[PDB]
Structure formats: C-alpha cells, structure tokens
Amino acid sequence: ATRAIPELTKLLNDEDQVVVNKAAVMVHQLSKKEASRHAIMRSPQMVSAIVRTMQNTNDVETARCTAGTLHNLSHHREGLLAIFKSGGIPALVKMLGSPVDSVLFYAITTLHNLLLHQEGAKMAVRLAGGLQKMVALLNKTNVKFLAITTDCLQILAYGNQESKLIILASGGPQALVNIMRTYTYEKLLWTTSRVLKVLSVCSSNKPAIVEAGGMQALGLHLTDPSQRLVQNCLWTLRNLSDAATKQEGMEGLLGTLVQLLGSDDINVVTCAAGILSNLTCNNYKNKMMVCQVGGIEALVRTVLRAGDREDITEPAICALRHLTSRHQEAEMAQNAVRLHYGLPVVVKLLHPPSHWPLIKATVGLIRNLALCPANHAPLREQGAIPRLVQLLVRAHQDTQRRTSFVEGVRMEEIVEGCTGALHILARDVHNRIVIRGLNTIPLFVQLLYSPIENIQRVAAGVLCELAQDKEAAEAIEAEGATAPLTELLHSRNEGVATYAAAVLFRMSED
Amino acid sequence: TLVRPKPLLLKLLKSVGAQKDTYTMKEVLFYLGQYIMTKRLYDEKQQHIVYCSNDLLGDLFGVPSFSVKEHRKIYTMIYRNLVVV
C-alpha cells in the first residue's frame, strides 16, 4: 500500500523547523521495517524532501534521522537509484564536513554502498566534492570508520589518474602513512596498503610517499600473519623503491627483506630482491647494512635455489654487483661470494637458456667479482674466459649488421661489458695465455675504431693488460694498433689519453 | 688505500726524504720513481729498462734488471715489502 506518502511529503517541507524534527523522528522509525521501507523507496517525492532536509537543517536529531533513513535504504536495491536520481550524492558528501560522528557512519556508509552496488556514483562523487572531504576526514580517532573511508578512496582512485592526482594535492600520501604507522587493525591496514599501491604506479606520487616516510612504515607490517597484507606492502615498495635511494631509517627494513629471501613464496622473493636491487644502486651505507645482516649468504643461496628463473636471478645479480662495487665493504663482498659457493652458478648464467637482459647484468658482475684477486683462478676454472669471448663474438657479429632493442639490450653494451670484464681478468698471467690463445687480439683492434668512448676505454685498456708479455706485445704491434692508437692520445676523456698510450709504451720501443 | 711499508723498503723512501710512516700507493709509486730518476737507473739509450744490480732495488725486488711496464710484477714486487692497512 501507498496512500500516505503525500501526507508524509509536505510535512518535512514545513517552514516550522520544530515540526520537521517531530516529522522525521518517525520516518527513520518507520523505515526500519522491510514493509514500510518499500513505500519510501517507491516515492521519489518523499526522498526528494529527505535530501533537502539533510543539506538544509540546523538540528542534530533531524540530520541523524534523515541520513539514518538513507542508510536503511542502501541495503535494498531500488532504494539506491532513488537516492541517485534525487541528487543525493552532492548532499551526502556535504555531510562529510559537518562535524558529528552519528551522521558519518550513516553518510560514509551510504556513499560506500553507492560506490559499489550502483554505477555512475564513481563519477558523480569525483565531480561533486568527494575525495576532498574523504581525505580530510582521515584523522578521526575511530578505526572501523577509516576502513570504510580508505576503501572509498581505493574505488575512486582505481585506474583513474584524475583521482590519483586529486588525492595527491590534498596532502594524501603524508596522511596515509600515519595510518599504517599507527593503527593495528588488519582490515584498515590491508585497505590503506591497497590504496598506496594504486598511488605508487603513477610516477607523480612516487616520491611524495617516500618523502613522508612510506618505506620505513610499510616495513613494520612485513611480519604480520595475513599474507593478503604482506604481499601488498612488498608490491608497493617494489614499484615505490625507484625514488627511495636517498634517505635513512631503513635500518630494520633491510634486516627483514634478507630473511624473506628464505621464504617458500616465490612471489615474495621476486618482490624482495627487486627491492634490494633498487635500494642499493647509489647509497653508500645501504650496502654496508646488507653486508652486515648476512646479505651475501642469504642472497647467494637465492640464485642457487631459483634456477634458470631469470626473474629471480636478474635482481639478485644486480644486488650482488652493487654490494661488491664502490664502498668500504668491497673486499669482503667480493670474497663472501666465493666462500658461500656462489662463483660456479654465476658462470652458468652466462650460458643459455638465459636471456640477454640477465646476461648483461651478469657479465657486469664478473668485472666486480674479479677485483679481489682470490677470484681470478676459480673464474678461469669455471670456463669464464671462453664463454665471455663467445658472448663478445656474437655481440660484435650482430652490431656489425650495419649493412642494413625489443629484447631490451643495446648490443653495444655487451661489448662494453665483456671487454670491460676481460680487462680485469687479464691481470692473472694464466688468463693472459687463455685470452691470447683464444685468438682475440685481432678482434680488439677492430673494436678500437668504435666511436663509443666506453669501448675505447676498455679495448685500449685490456690490450694494456696484455702488453706485459712480449709474446703478445710485438704480436699486437703487427695486427694494426700502430696507427689507430696513434691519435687516440688526444681524445677528450683522460681515461683514453692514457691506456691507449700505455700500450704504445712497450711495443715498438727497443 | 693505505699501506705501511716494511722498514727495509722505508730506507728507499727515507733516502729521497720521506717523512711519514704510512703512504698511499700513489706516494710510494712517486717516491720510488724519484729515486730511479735521481740515482739514474734507467738506460738513457732506450729508457724503458731499469737497472739495479748492486742497488737497494736489487735487494728489495730481487731481479737485477726489470722493465718499466711489466705492471703486475712491479705491482707485486712492491706488494711483498708492505703490510696493508
């Protein structure tokens, strides 16, 4: 039955703001039953007055009864469209500003149901004042309320970079961090982390979250039991560690990712070595802390038990390259790879079926592993020289197709790294016999014409490391090198004015 | 990189006039090149050979005559009369 709604309609529009309180006191009361609830939904003339009384009242019981009535309609289906076709969205979001707790649990919920169980609201809320009021109400002392508020931010900023930017200018990241750093409720932390991820992929919010302190705070909950929260934190940092190279506080964060390398979840390790691969590219003391928590043994073990899976070995080799290059703990990090039996596997990654982007990082790890002379012999025993030459051969016999990426490797980089690694390996005299015996000298001379200033740095450098033995010296002075090196002594970088002259010093002298 | 040489080598650096007791490899390769050039140990005909038959270098190194650019040997001949720090 209807037959009572126009009777209930005009009384709310009474200009006496006292009878309205005595009118809506029973509408919220009459909306509790499923029976009389259907009567209010079927009448847009009735709902069009509850909306007005909400955005136009000075009383408290009226706002609680009005917005409380709209919550009782959100559970039912055709009670949402009436709220949406009566223009309720701009009014509900308004009540996200009037300070009162009793209306917010009724307003932020009625909006939450509208964001999911009815289309269009995800666009109307963005237009009509939403993300402003939602982010502004993140400082409430309640926790369950924030579980609904933060979840509405995930629905609106989802794949919509307009909304993603909107939350940014409101001081969004700085406020979302203080929620993970403080509260302990799993459902809120799972949602807040679920929001920070769809804020990380946009390269505008990426430094802002780091700047506030997102990394150091997200690592606190890496030990929490719920894996639905754990991998979301790791997924965030993986996308969010690109711009976190220049700040401290990660002391415990590095003493936790290492233990995750010994985890039975393959997707966790992949999202753990990729973090250390990025958090060790430029920082000095970061590499110290990794070495100081046993980072080598736990990381070397990962490449062993991960197999030809390049997706795990690619960040792991880069991480070892960083810890072994240019810092105080270099002599040890180049040594702990040998003591923990990591040398043989690294040479195996050179051979197929390893793709090129991994090989590019491995041939660059060899030049760091060969700095400590205690690794010259084991590399020769594992067949490093005959393999590095093989990759060097094809890399030149592929970029020589000038007569004419996608894989991700500029083929001039493999030549830049292989001839750079051999320059370090050519220090042990036994390597200088193998490199000479493989018939490689007449190849470095052709590389000496490369217009790359990094090819000439190592090509005219590895020949300098071969110039000691006269058995190779006067052999080089025959197959070219006499004329092309003559005017390498005026190139700009002082790394090529030398070297290229260091070769000429021993050849055609006496 | 800092190294503290053994006193049987310090006499060479103290001869040109060394003051410190520890040096960088830049300074050791500097004070040593000053001695060969002061005491005249190169062969001025073709100058990439250094002679040290009955000299301090002939006692420190062990070879009566070494070339200038044999590198690793010179790098290691120095690397026995020092204790790295």
Partner: peptide, 13 residues
Amino acid sequence: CFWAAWDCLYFIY
C-alpha cells in the same frame, strides 16, 4: 720518455 712512462704506470694503480 721515462717521465712519460711512470705516469702511465701509476694509472692502473
């Protein structure tokens, strides 16, 4: 030629 020698000597350190 000796002065231009020991400089390239201490270049690979």
